[PDB]
């Protein structure tokens, strides 16, 4: 097992915005992704626009300051650090991907759901129907729901 936030009130901040999408559409995708996890836990998420946040959201390309360089278009889409101080919790998205509000390119909302799972301390699921399954695939975003496995996983960390 890994680490967890030793608190239930968790802040996030968007460091910077992909030019792929409009600013409002980015904020929304991220907000809705946090809400997915909020809906099945006691966790409360708050966006801040300046200052120290628990989870920093970053778009960057190639080698971008950690031990985990991105790899251009395709392959790695994003990654996130487990709960902890400093870079802990932070979620990074590869700017070399084309981020979208829909099924075009790589869907930011679905990807954020997956990465925030990691930011909260989840690992991967062996269940192909779970959002924490290790590879991207588009599913209808209006009908999207966490799988029972995702809910089991997150509730085992936060009660
Ligand atoms: N070359 C690679 O692709 C490597 C290989 C994996 C490894 O060995 O680390 N991947 C990597 O390095 C990184 C690691 C970071 C992470 O895992 O988040 N992974 C990645 O870059 C991929 C991260 C990702 C994983 C899953 C999803 C999604 C799943 C779903 C979904 C919805 C319903 C049902 C089923 C699925 C919607 S969206 C989105 C994004
Ligand atoms: Ca990539
Ligand atoms: Ca952090
Ligand atoms: Ca891009
Ligand atoms: Zn990174
Ligand atoms: Zn993952």
Curated annotation (Swiss-Prot):
The active site is at 115. It is found in: Secreted, Extracellular space, Extracellular matrix. Found in alveolar macrophages but not in peripheral blood monocytes. Ca(2+) 3 binds at residues 71-72, 74, 76, 94, 97. It comes from the Eukaryota. Induction: By exposure to bacterial lipopolysaccharides (LPS). Inhibited by dexamethasone. Zn(2+) 1 binds at residues 64, 66, 79, 92. Ca(2+) 2 binds at residues 54, 86, 88, 90. Its main location: secreted. GO terms for cellular component: cytoplasm; extracellular matrix; extracellular region; extracellular space; nucleus. GO terms for biological process: bronchiole development; cellular response to virus; collagen catabolic process; elastin catabolic process; extracellular matrix disassembly; extracellular matrix organization; lung alveolus development; negative regulation of endothelial cell-matrix adhesion via fibronectin. One of its GO terms (molecular function) is metalloendopeptidase activity. Ca(2+) 1 binds at residues 20, 95, 97. Zn(2+) 2 binds at residues 114, 118, 124. Keywords: Calcium, Disulfide bond, Extracellular matrix, Glycoprotein, Hydrolase, Metal-binding, Metalloprotease, Protease, Repeat, Secreted, Signal, Zinc, Zymogen. The conserved cysteine present in the cysteine-switch motif binds the catalytic zinc ion, thus inhibiting the enzyme. The dissociation of the cysteine from the zinc ion upon the activation-peptide release activates the enzyme. Belongs to the peptidase M10A family. May be involved in tissue injury and remodeling. Has significant elastolytic activity. Can accept large and small amino acids at the P1' site, but has a preference for leucine. Aromatic or hydrophobic residues are preferred at the P1 site, with small hydrophobic residues (preferably alanine) occupying P3. This is Macrophage metalloelastase. It comes from Homo sapiens. The chain holds residues 106 to 263 of 470 of the full protein.
